[PDB]
Design a binder for this molecule. Structure first.
Ligand SMILES: CC(C)C[C@H](N)C(=O)O
Ligand SMILES: CC(C)C[C@H](N)C(=O)O
Length: 1002
């Protein structure tokens, strides 16, 4: 267990060496004169300071942190800067729940959590409360973040970090410029528009301030008024005097000629209220409150409630329903009503919505429904479905003529009502044909929008907006609002959308689906609700009631990095003396136009011209964004707005558009999800404490590198630190016993197989590092290097040669330094090599002879082969490697070799087999082991290439064992393992065994 500590000491040792050495401060005036290879720029989606950083952030980043700890050891520059989001509410949210959960209850509260994990963080109770105002959140968290990274030891120029609210006056200048530019280009606009909106927040709550439904929007429905005729039912008494209409939502309004009644759920609570113009509306409150914030009531947002009840009390009185050849229809119960979607009412469209015929039919069957709630001689019976839409497989009575053949007679078939409403679903959007007196033959799709708008002008119908599913901001469930005010951003452009689809067809998607989620969300993304009024953030330049919502003031932010060290040099809040000496007051809109837009004129400035070209040079050298990477949940929203924008201010400049991004899955701790709510979670500061960040870094590079859910498992970060500590002591020990390593040359065989393994490994390792799939590059360069170093200490019984033993620890201590820098710098220094290790390069992959490795992956095959047939039955073993080409085996290879060397990469008949393998007196009683093993050539030949046919088989098998048996006495744990030629075999294994399947009997 001291293993964890030993690392933990030298990690902070080599850190306070690195940091006092200032190793990562990549400047662009001193490292641009050196014409080296080309830059490498790695940017992270800067997390909020709404709380200590978590593994889900560390894995979301480790893909880049390693990347640069490698792409530097290939000679490329490495600007890995790091931002710090403070905009957006989510800070104003957890501590506002702190400010009112400390308000109405004692300090701390009494019950029968939100405060309790600000004290389960540990703070002596007093400190915890200064949190409820936002400004102490932002004086305290950007520290804990940067300390946990200094301690993770990440390759990050310090002087380029910051804060993103108005707190930091400098970035604010950067945000203000962006928007004065983005307003100049008629990319912003003002309007009164529908948006997901937090009642209780006072602003349209859209994307990164939600609990449910990151990618969710308004759904539109038509709403119908349903004149309720007297006799009203019992509870409606007092309101004699006003026009009352039941309100429901259908999405096939072409169908409403098919109205035959009106459905509500007898045991749902219903509300009725008066609009602004003064008539009476009965929906649920989710519906009511939704209408309200949509200007539907007198004062925007208020529900003028007049009475309450449940549908029980409603069933009965006739509803006169517009557009239907049944004007005196009634309200009937439908207990299967989705109790959230819609109004709490639905329509009765029996001829194109099967539930309804099920609904109708049951009321017609049992008198245990036929008088159920006020159901007279007329109620359900003479109502029959309405032929309005014919669909050319089945009938005008479509939704019936389908469930009267799939026989959904019972109304309790809700799975089989998943059957039903999927039937007349959308096919009935085109094949369905309107038949009414006025559209006979018209396509239901080209008249959909007309029949609906005919019903608005007739004052019979209006238009309803509802949450597609549900949201929780952090609290009160949200709503489409007719927001009477919102500055918003125009992602609905025709031009800008197309030039940006092209910014995507350029930018590199690390996979084949990520692009599909960028198409499907771009061809989906309309204009955006980008202005908050309460929370935290920066204020709009010209209308300062408005603050900027998070997901938009965080889009071009990457260029501040390029100049941050000089526009701030370390004070995140932006109050220390900015290194170059710019007054935050002296960064006019056009001196950004200068520093960023290349051709844009040198402005009349009261700062001399030195710093002006120097901050632009920084920019001009560092940009573009090479590779950014974050979780797969900022694919539809933030990374997206991050593509539009980077076009929007350089719509001309092709070069600076982000060129490559990367998204992973979420992370799992021990194969299960990571929500504090579970107990399966670790803040970065503790993963480190427990596992020696190098040890952690390990389990992350093994987290999986794919976009599908990448898992992190505690144990393997433990076994991590162990194979690490056995290494260091081995490397310690193998430099003590220098006097133990062979003189002369490195000439023996075991030597050369390890030595070509070694270089086989360095390149294998190289190929996956180039391709940033860190797990598979882990496997190649660490697991495969241990086993092959073990196994060449295994078979060098005359001593491991030192000049192979040393160039091997060089390469590994290197190969591994991107994964685990301090421990490698320790080793590299341990060797008494001079410079810090980050001043090393990519080691030279020497000359490789893979026919040597062929043998290596042949013995690992049999190593893996006989580990198997020992399960049944067990100590000794003699292994017959068959003697030679039998007169029936040589010949197979011989004749097939003949055809092959004459047929251009395609092989003959599968019954040509029979005529050729059959018609051979050489094959008179052994074709039954040439035809079952003429599939030994069409099964395992792609396995290697043109190998098992080219007769001579470039290595003696008998003897690449008889050498391995020491390691193979291990790895099979037997005692002795001899090998006979199948010359002294039982002849059931001489004249049977295929070289490549060596047979073996205990
Ligand atoms: C730039 C931001 C939208 C990033 C996001 N808030 C995160 O925690 O990763
Ligand atoms: C989906 C529902 C709200 C409306 C649909 N026209 C129906 O069959 O009832």
């Amino acid at each position: 267990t001291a293993k964890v500590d030993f690392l933990k000491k030298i990690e902070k040792e080599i850190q306070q060496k690195w940091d006092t050495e200032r190793v990562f401060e990549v400047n662009a005036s001193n490292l641009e004169k050196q014409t080296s290879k080309g830059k490498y720029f790695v940017t992270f989606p800067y997390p909020y300071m709404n709380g200590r950083l978590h593994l889900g952030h560390t894995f979301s980043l480790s893909k880049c942190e390693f990347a640069v700890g490698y792409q530097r050891l290939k000679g490329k520059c490495c600007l890995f800067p790091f931002g710090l989001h403070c905009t957006g509410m989510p800070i104003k949210a957890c501590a506002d729940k702190l400010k009112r959960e400390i308000e109405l209850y004692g300090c701390p509260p009494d019950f029968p959590y939100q405060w309790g994990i600000m004290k389960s963080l540990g703070l002596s109770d007093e400190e915890i409360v200064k949190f409820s105002e936002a400004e102490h959140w932002l004086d305290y968290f950007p520290p804990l973040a940067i300390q946990d990274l200094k301690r993770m030891g990440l390759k990050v120029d310090w002087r380029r970090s910051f804060i993103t609210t108005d707190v930091n006056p400098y970035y604010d200048s950067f945000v203000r410029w962006q928007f004065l530019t983005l307003r100049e280009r008629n990319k912003i606009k003002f309007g009164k528009r529908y948006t997901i909106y937090s009642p209780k927040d006072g602003q349209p709550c859209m994307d990164h301030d939600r609990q449910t439904g990151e990618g969710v929007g308004p759904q539109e429905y038509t709403l119908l008024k349903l004149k309720v005729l007297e006799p009203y039912p019992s509870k409606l008494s007092g309101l004699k005097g006003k026009n009352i209409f039941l309100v429901a939502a259908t999405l096939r309004p072409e169908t409403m000629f098919g109205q035959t009644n009106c459905w509500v759920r007898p045991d749902m609570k219903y509300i009725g209220f008066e609009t602004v113009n003064g008539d009476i509306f009965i929906c649920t409150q989710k519906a009511a409150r939704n209408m309200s914030y949509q200007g539907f009531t007198k004062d925007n947002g208020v529900v003028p409630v007049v009475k309450e009840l449940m549908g029980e009390e409603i069933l009965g009185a006739s509803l006169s329903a517009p557009l239907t050849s049944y004007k005196v229809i009634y309200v009937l119960p439908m207990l299967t009503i989705k109790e959230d979607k819609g109004t709490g009412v639905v329509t009765s469209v029996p001829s194109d919505s099967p539930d309804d015929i099920a609904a109708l039919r049951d009321l017609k069957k049992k008198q245990a429904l036929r008088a159920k709630y006020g159901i007279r001689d007329d109620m359900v019976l003479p109502f029959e479905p309405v032929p309005v839409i014919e669909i050319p497989g089945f009938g005008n009575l479509s939704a019936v003529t389908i469930c009267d053949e799939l026989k959904i007679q019972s109304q309790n078939d809700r799975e089989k009502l998943a059957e039903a409403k999927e039937k007349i679903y959308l096919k009935g959007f085109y094949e369905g044909i309107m038949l009414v007196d006025g559209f006979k033959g018209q396509k239901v799709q080209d008249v959909k929008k007309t029949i609906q708008k005919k019903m608005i002008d007739a004052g019979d119908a209006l238009i309803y907006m509802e949450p597609e599913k549900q949201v929780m901001s952090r609290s009160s469930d949200e709503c489409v609002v007719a927001l009477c005010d919102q500055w918003y951003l125009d992602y609905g452009e025709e031009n800008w959308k197309k030039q940006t689809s092209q910014c995507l067809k350029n930018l590199e998607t690390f996979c084949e689906e990520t692009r599909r989620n960028f198409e499907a969300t771009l061809g989906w993304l309309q204009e955006h609700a980008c202005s908050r009024t309460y929370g935290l953030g920066t204020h709009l330049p010209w209308d300062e009631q408005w603050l900027i919502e998070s997901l938009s003031d965080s889009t071009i932010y990457m260029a501040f990095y390029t100049v941050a060290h000089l526009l701030q040099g370390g004070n995140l809040h932006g109050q220390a003396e900015s290194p170059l000496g710019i007054r935050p007051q002296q960064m006019t809109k056009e001196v950004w136009d200068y520093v960023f837009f290349k051709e844009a004129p040198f402005p009349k400035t009261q700062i001399a011209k030195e710093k002006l070209d120097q901050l632009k040079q920084e920019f001009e050298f560092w940009y573009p964004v090479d590779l950014r990477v974050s979780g797969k949940d900022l694919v539809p929203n933030h990374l997206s707005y991050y593509l539009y924008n980077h076009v929007a201010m350089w719509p001309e400049q092709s070069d600076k558009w982000p060129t490559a991004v990367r998204a992973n899955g979420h992370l799992l701790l021990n194969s299960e999800k990571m929500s504090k709510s579970t107990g399966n979670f670790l803040t970065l500061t503790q993963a480190i404490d427990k596992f020696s960040a190098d040890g952690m870094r390990l389990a992350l590079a093994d987290a999986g590198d794919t976009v599908e859910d990448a898992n992190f498992v505690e144990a393997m970060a433990d076994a991590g630190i162990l194979r690490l500590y056995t290494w260091v002591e081995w490397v310690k020990e193998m430099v003590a016993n220098w006097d133990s390593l062979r003189s002369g040359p490195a000439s023996t065989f075991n030597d050369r197989v390890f030595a070509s393994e070694l270089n086989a490994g360095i390149i294998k390792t190289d190929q996956n590092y180039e391709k940033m799939m860190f797990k598979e590059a882990l496997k190649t360069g660490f697991f495969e290097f241990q086993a092959a170093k073990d196994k060449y200490r295994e078979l060098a019984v005359e001593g491991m040669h030192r000049e192979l033993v040393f160039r091997f620890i060089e390469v590994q201590t290197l190969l591994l330094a991107p994964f685990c820098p301090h421990l490698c710098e320790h080793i590299w220094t341990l060797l008494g090599k001079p410079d810090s290790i980050m001043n090393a390069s990519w080691p030279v992959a020497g000359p490789v002879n893979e026919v040597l490795i062929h043998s290596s992956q042949y013995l690992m095959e049999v190593t893996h082969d006989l580990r198997l047939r020992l399960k049944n039955y067990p100590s000794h073993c003699t292994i017959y490697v068959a003697k030679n080409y039998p007169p029936w085996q040589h010949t197979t290879l011989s004749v097939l070799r003949k055809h092959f060397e004459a047929n251009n990469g395609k092989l003959p008949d599968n019954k040509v087999i029979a005529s050729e393998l059959g018609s051979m007196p050489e094959l008179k009683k052994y074709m039954k082991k040439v035809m079952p093993f003429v599939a030994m050539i069409k099964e395992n030949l792609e396995k290697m290439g043109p190998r098992i046919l080219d007769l001579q088989l470039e290595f003696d098998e008998k003897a690449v064992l008889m050498e391995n048996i020491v390691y193979l006495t291990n790895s099979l744990e037997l005692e002795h393992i001899e090998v006979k030629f199948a010359s002294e075999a039982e002849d059931k294994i001489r004249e049977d065994c295929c070289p490549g399947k060596p047979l073996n009997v205990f």
